[PDB]
Amino acid sequence: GCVSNLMVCNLAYSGKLEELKESILADKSLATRTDQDSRTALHWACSAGHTEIVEFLLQLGVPVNDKDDAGWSPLHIAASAGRDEIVKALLGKGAQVNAVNQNGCTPLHYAASKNRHEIAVMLLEGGANPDAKDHYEATAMHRAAAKGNLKMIHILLYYKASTNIQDTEGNTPLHLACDEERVEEAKLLVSQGASIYIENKEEKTPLQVAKGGLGLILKRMVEG
C-alpha cells in the first residue's frame, strides 16, 4: 500500500531498489524531494528496513539528520522500528544521536521502551546522552524501570545513566519501579545508588510507594 504521494518514497518503502536507482540516477534531485509528511526516501527506507536502499542514498550524499513533520529523523525511525543494520549505517554517516522530535524524545527513548538492546548500545556507544529528558522530563531509565526491562537497565547503568533524576511528577526511576513493583529492578536500582529517601511531588518516597513486601527489602538493603 502507498504511503506517499511521492513515487520514490513508495519505491523506497517497498524495496524497489533497481527502480529507485533508475529514478534517482535520472534525477538526483529525487533523493532529497519531500512528500506529504515531509519525508524523503531515506525516512521511508529506514521505516521499512531496506538496508541496501539506505546505503545507496547515504553514499549519494543525502542528509541523515533531516526531520519529517513530527520531528522524526531517520535515526528516530530506524531506532523505533528495530532496524539494527540501518542504525549502524546512519551512525557511520554521522547521524546526530541526540536529535529530539516534536514530542521531546531522542532515538534512545524509543530504543529503550521498545527494548532495542543492540540499538541502545550502538546509540550510547555513539555518544547518546543517557539522561536526555522528554517533555515530561522522563529519561530512558524511567521507562525501563517502569516496564521493568531489566537487561536495559543494565545497559543504561553501564553507560552512566542517572538513577536519581525526577520527571515533572517528581518521580525517579526507583519510584516507578516500586509503584509497579519491579523487585530485581528496584533492588538493582538501589544497589547502584538510587535514593530510597527522595520524595516526589506527593512527598512520598520510593519505600512509601511500594507494596510492603518490597519496601522492606529495600530498607534492609540500605539500612537493615
DSSP string, 113-139: HTT-HHHHHHHHHTT--TT---SS---
Cβ contacts of residue 25 below 8 Å, gap of 6+?
none
What is the C-alpha separation between 224 and 218, in angstroms, rounded? 9
What is the four-CA torsion angle of 78, 84, 85, 86, rounded to 10 degrees? 10
Domain that holds residue 39: 1-224
Residue 110's Cα: distance from chain center in Å? 3
For residues 122 and 159, the answer to whether their CB atoms sit within 8 Å is no
Give the list of residues 6+ apart from residue 94 with CB closer than 8 angstroms, or none.
Answer: 64
The residue behind cell 549519494 is 60
Contact 20, 53 (CB under 8 A): yes
SS3 18: helix
Q: How far apart are CA 114 and CA 102, in angstroms?
A: 19
| Collapsed DSSP state (helix, strand, coil) of residue 183 | helix
Resolution (A): 2.2
Instruction: Round the CA-based radius of gyration of the chain to a whole number and report it.
Output: 21
Contact between residue 128 and residue 108 where contact means Cβ atoms under 8 Å apart: yes
Experimental method reported for this structure: X-ray
Which amino acid does the sequence have at 179?
Answer: D
C-alpha cell at 140: 530512558
To the nearest 5 percent, what fractions of the chain are helix, strand and coil?
Answer: 50, 0, 50
The one-letter code for the residue type at 180 is E
Q: Count CB-CB contacts under 10 A for residue 108.
A: 29
- C-alpha cell of 56? 545507496
Q: Which three cell numbers stand for residue 152?
A: 536495559
> Are the CB atoms for 153 and 113 separated by under 8 Å?
no
* Residues 86, 70 contacting (CB under 8 angstroms): no
CB atoms within 10 A of CB 180: 16
Q: Nearest 5°: phi and psi at 91? A: -60, -30
- Cα angle 92, 98, 102 (rounded to 5 degrees) comes to 125
Measured distance CA(20)–CA(28) in Å, rounded:
11
Rounded to whole angstroms, the Cα distance separating 178 from 181 reads 5
Count structural domains, the chain: 1
Give the Cβ contact number of residue 151 at 10 Å.
11
- Whether the CA torsion 210, 213, 215, 221 is positive or negative: it is negative
Cα(80)–Cα(170) distance, rounded to whole angstroms?
Answer: 27
Q: How far is Cα 73 from Cα 50, in angstroms, rounded to an integer?
A: 16
Q: CB count, 10 Å around CB of 90?
A: 28
C-beta of residue 204 within 8 angstroms of C-beta of residue 170: no
